[PDB]
Design a binder for this molecule. Sequence first.
Ligand SMILES: O=C(O)c1ccnc(-c2ccco2)c1
Lengths: 135, 143
Amino acid sequence: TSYGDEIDKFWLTQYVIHRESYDFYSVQVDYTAVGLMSTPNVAESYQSKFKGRNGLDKVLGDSETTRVKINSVILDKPHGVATIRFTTVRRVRSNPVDDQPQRWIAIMGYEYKNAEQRYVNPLGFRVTSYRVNPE
Amino acid sequence: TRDQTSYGDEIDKFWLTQYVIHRESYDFYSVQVDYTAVGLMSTPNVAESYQSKFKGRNGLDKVLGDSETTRVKINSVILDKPHGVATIRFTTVRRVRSNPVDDQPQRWIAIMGYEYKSLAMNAEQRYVNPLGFRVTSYRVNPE
Ligand SMILES: O=C(O)c1ccnc(-c2ccco2)c1
């Protein structure tokens, strides 16, 4: 539907933070929220990295982490697309210092449309398209 | 849409900081929206107290107009979800248009009480407060 720019930027940036970060303790909720907030087509594309004994949570486990910081969020409400530019920083538990930051661009399409969704996606936020690219 | 005291850390933190920004900033080109957002997000008591400064020939926007502006910067947020209480430390920086530089920043502590209510809401009201967030108590003090 339509809820306002700042409401859009919250779910959009909260989505990027859920999907582009890695912390073993939070992968459960981070993984779940990405589902409700994604179309099944875009959802399975994300779930591909967690299947089998080679899944990210299985292979990486707790050895490292990756944090996200949002730097800008532009909107296009009539069309339902947004361009988010964020930065990630990786670090393994044994790492001496954090890895050099990496800059990214997220081209996203969103829309609005269960008791578990209460503390995750009450407004029915859903991402229909997603594409991350470097800078 | 529902009566709940909390919606989670990141959701509560969004509305609480949104409330402080709408109520503690001053932008003439936006004050009408801010004034409306604060009223929707507040109980009648909290709303009546806030709207006092806008009444009369000496209402805030009637006096200040576009001569000055004040922007907010959120520093930290501490939630007590079970009791609908939150502490928000923020900074304001005022710029008088008739000055070359800005005023010196001011630091504040906001003690707030919040809740969510399922209240009848029109289209334009749901577009701004979909989850029915509202402040039940509001007190600002310097730090
Ligand atoms: O000049 C200020 O810092 C100030 C103080 C109290 N309310 C406001 C305000 C403007 C629009 C909504 O709320 C601004």
